[PDB]
Every structure is written in structure tokens, then in C-alpha cells.
Amino acid sequence: AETEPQVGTAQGLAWTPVGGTLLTIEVAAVPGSGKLSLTGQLGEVMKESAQAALTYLRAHTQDYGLPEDFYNKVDLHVHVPDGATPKDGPSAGITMATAIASALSRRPARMDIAMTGEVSLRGKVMPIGGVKEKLLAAHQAGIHKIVLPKDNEAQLEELPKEVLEGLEIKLVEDVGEVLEYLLLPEPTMPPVV
Amino acid sequence: AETEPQVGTAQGLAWTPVGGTLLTIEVAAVPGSGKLSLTGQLGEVMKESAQAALTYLRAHTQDYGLPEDFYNKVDLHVHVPDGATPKDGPSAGITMATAIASALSRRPARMDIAMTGEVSLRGKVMPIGGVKEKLLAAHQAGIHKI
């Protein structure tokens, strides 16, 4: 795991058949015409998950301190390292929302909280599959604060208790809970516009 | 190894299942209104590496003397000779950043220094593979600073 709060960078959990792992989404909000380049070898499901999260943020601009016309002025670029790693799936729905909001809002995203979860269009955090292996890989790297869907509450009764005595699980249902649990309430950099 | 510092050119290291092989990255910065043509039969990952390096340089224009607006004033063009070598993998990413910044800054890059390395979007240099054959082929062409 990384250690420090970064700006427009979100820590997230992945899943394989060889054991789950971490993956960070880092995005950039550079000035431009307004489009959405989605590099880092992503499947179309994760691209649509990105467009859904971005559509939710376009529908709420006065809540989270975002600039207003970031749809025809800000040329977003979503990059999921590393290359040559086919990565896709709707599971990184909350991660991309936090990353995009931290980048557009100039407020950092504290990297010592792993997260997961699928975002709707109304802002309705939906359940996922495979919570256990994501949690174990989160605990290996030394992270001790989790974000998870409220619907994922029956999935937690298969971990060891020695794992469960460390990990303090948050169980959210909507987006604004995560967006106020992962942001420092302070802008740092000058904005894009 | 070309001796003189070239403008818009970066010596690079790639490897095939023959052994190591030098690559140069010629880059032209010709006027237009903001495009990105990636010729020379590049793979997809290598194009994405070029896009990542340009996004990093768009984020950090004041650091290197890059122009004040070049997302919509300059059509860049990145050629990787020769034209019958299919090339892929994310290994060359910091050579693309070197070539693009030298072309956009007009400061000639050194050609007596080989390089390799994958690039992030924050700017981190992430580790790559095949160091052995790349440094052997950098030596046999008479390059001594890696």
C-alpha cells in the first residue's frame, strides 16, 4: 500500500483467480475540450462504469465543490496502471467516482482506506462479488479502514476473526457517505480553470 | 549510437527474441490545432504509453518550459523507425516523454544515453522487464551511460 494522501488518486481492490490484489486508479483533469480518454487497457464494462460515475457527478455540481462547466472545458484522462494487464469489471465503481471527484475538486484522497463497490446512475451503491479475497489482500498491505456496500453485510461472516478484529468496516448505501469519508476538506492545488 | 544531441530524438532500448535492439524515437512538433498521430506500426499499449506521457506533460507545463497551450495549437506526430518492425509492450515510456519534451521545448536530447522505463500519470517510473539484453545491446553499440 501507499502511505499518504494523494490528489486525484484512489486506492482500490481487485480480484483474480490467483488471489485478489490492489490497483490504484489515478486520473488527470487537464484543460481541454471535454472528452474522456480511458487508457490502461480497460474493458468496455469498466468504461461504462466510468461514464456512469461521471454522469452522477455531472448531476451534482453544487454539492461537492466542483467547477460547474467541467463537461465542455476539462479533458479528463483515466489511467489504471499498469499496462498490459487486462482489467475490467463494474466493481471499481466507487473508486473511479472518488478519483474523479478528487481530481476535479482539488481536494486530496486519503490513500489508507481501501474500497470497492458498484455505482448506479442515481447514486445507489450496489453489491459486488468476492468480498473476502479483496479484504484479505487489503489487510496484507497494511490498510485498516474499509469502505463497502451496506448490502455486503452477510458476506463478512466468512473471514477469520483475527482478520476481523483489525479491519473496521464501513457499510455505506449511497455516494455522499463515501465522498465525505475519503476527502480531506481542503483544496490544495490551483484548479483546472 | 548517434553522437550529437538531436532535437526531438531519444535513444531507446527494446528487445526482440533475437536479442536487444536500439530504438530511436523521432518526434515532430508541427503546427495545427491539436492531434496525435502515432505511426510506425505501433501496438495499442505503446500508443497508450504515449498518451499517458503527453497527459503528464500537459499537467506540468511550467516545470520544463513547454508552451503555454499545446493541446489545441500543435499537432504532434510520433514516428518510430523502421516501418516494418511491429513493436509493443509498455517498456518505452520515458523515452517518449524525453522525445516529446525535447521536441516541445527545443532542447536537444543526449543520444549517448540509453534509457527504458514505464511511466505513470502522476509521474512515477514503474519497473519493467528484460534489463539484461537491453544493457548488453546498449554496450555493444558503444553506449556507456544508462
- The answer to whether B99 and B8 have CB atoms below 8 angstroms apart is yes
How many angstroms separate the CA atoms of A123 and A126, rounded? 9
- In sequence order, which ranges of chain A are alpha helices (DSSP H)? 44-58, 94-105, 131-140, 161-164, 176-181
Sheet containing A9-13: order of strands: A9-13, A22-31, A74-79, A36-38
A120 is catalytic: no
- Does B37 carry a binding-site annotation? no
- The answer to whether B23 and B140 have CB atoms below 8 angstroms apart is no
Contact A79 B120 (CB under 8 A): yes
Contact A83 B48 (CB under 8 A): yes
C-alpha cell at A22: 490492489
The reply to whether omega before A63 is within 30° of 0 (cis) is no
Question: What angle do helix axes A44-58 and A94-105 make, rounded to 10 degrees?
Answer: 50
- Method in brief: cryo-EM
Report the amino acid identity of residue B105.
Answer: S
How many angstroms separate the CA atoms of B112 and B103, rounded? 18
Contact A37 B52 (CB under 8 A): no
- Does A91 carry a binding-site annotation? yes
Return the half-sphere exposure (C-beta side, CA atoms, 13 A cut-off) of residue B58. Answer: 26
Angle, CA of A178, A180 and A186, to the nearest 5°: 140
Which residues, listed in sequence order, are joined to residue B125 by a DSSP beta bridge?
B119
Tally helices (H) and strands (E) across chain B.
Answer: 4, 6
Domains detected in chain B: 9-146 (3.30.230.10)
Q: Say if strands A168-172 and B9-16 run parallel, antiparallel, or are unpaired.
A: unpaired
How many angstroms separate the CA atoms of B24 and B42, rounded? 13
C-alpha cell at A129: 462479488
- The answer to whether A22 and A11 have CB atoms below 8 angstroms apart is yes
Q: Collapse the DSSP code of A133 into the 3-class scheme (helix H, G, I; strand E, B; otherwise coil) and give the result.
A: helix
The string over A77-97, giving b where at least 16 C-beta atoms fall within 10 Å of a residue's C-beta and e elsewhere, is bbbbbbbeeebebebbbbbbb
How many angstroms separate the CA atoms of A40 and A23, rounded? 12
Which residues, at least 6 apart from B140, have a Cβ–Cβ distance to it below 8 Å? none
Tell me whether residue A115 is exposed, middle or buried, using C-beta atoms within 10 angstroms of its C-beta: 0 to 12, 13 to 18, 19 or more: buried
Residues in B closer than 8 angstroms to A75, CB to CB, are 71
